[PDB]
Amino acid sequence: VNSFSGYLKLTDNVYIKNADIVEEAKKVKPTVVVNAANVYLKHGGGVAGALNKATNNAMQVESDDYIATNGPLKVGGSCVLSGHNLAKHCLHVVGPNVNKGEDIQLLKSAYENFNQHEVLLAPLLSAGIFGADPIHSLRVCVDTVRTNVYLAVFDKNLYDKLVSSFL
Numbered sequence: 136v137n138s139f140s141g142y143l144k145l146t147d148n149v150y151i152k153n154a155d156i157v158e159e160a161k162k163v164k165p166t167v168v169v170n171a172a173n174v175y176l177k178h179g180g181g182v183a184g185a186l187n188k189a190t191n192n193a194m195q196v197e198s199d200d201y202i203a204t205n206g207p208l209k210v211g212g213s214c215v216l217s218g219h220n221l222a223k224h225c226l227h228v229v230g231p232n233v234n235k236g237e238d239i240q241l242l243k244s245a246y247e248n249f250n251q252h253e254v255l256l257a258p259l260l261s262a263g264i265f266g267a268d269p270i271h272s273l274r275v276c277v278d279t280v281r282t283n284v285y286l287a288v289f290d291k292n293l294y295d296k297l298v299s300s301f302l
């Protein structure tokens with residue numbers, strides 16, 4: 136039993152809710168919240184901009200030190216950093232950005248990072264400003280992640296479409 140509430144069950148291990156991931160994290164304080172990161176950990180907009188703003192920019196400060204030490208992530212890769220006031224940990228995961236021409240097959244590699252964590256609160260990778268089809272992203276999620284994932288979808292219209300088209 137865990138504290139996630141109001142989610143629709145899609146599969147054995149994947150759950151989904153129309154929710155603001157920032158507000159969801161603030162209320163649940165999950166062990167892991169996933170950020171929709173880029174390779175530079177520049178949290179300017181989308182989910183990343185919202186999460187960073189909620190930390191009063193502490194996420195960005197920590198991220199800049201991480202990059203200065205380690206260099207950029209790989210597309211499809213991840214790193215674990217602090218969750219600040221939102222979660223114990225933040226798993227920064229880089230899905231491909233179609234608006235940069237990155238290969239969409241890297242989306243499966245991105246979701247594989249979730250399997251290193253038993254339970255996660257997460258957005259749909261490569262959705263929103265990353266330019267992928269969220270229905271495709273949900274399919275890859277369900278077919279790749281084996282751990283327990285609670286997906287927060289900000290847009291109600293999109294949430295209803297994801298549910299209604301789910302196979």
Ligand SMILES: Cc1oc(C(N)=O)cc1S(=O)(=O)Nc1cnc(Cl)c(C#N)c1
Pocket residue numbers: 171180181182183230258259260261262263264265267268269287288289290293
């Ligand atoms: C309102 C909205 O539109 C779309 C769309 N496909 O156009 C997605 C969303 S979201 O807010 O519900 N989830 C979301 C938002 N931002 C980002 Cl960067 C990601 C990722 N990775 C995921």
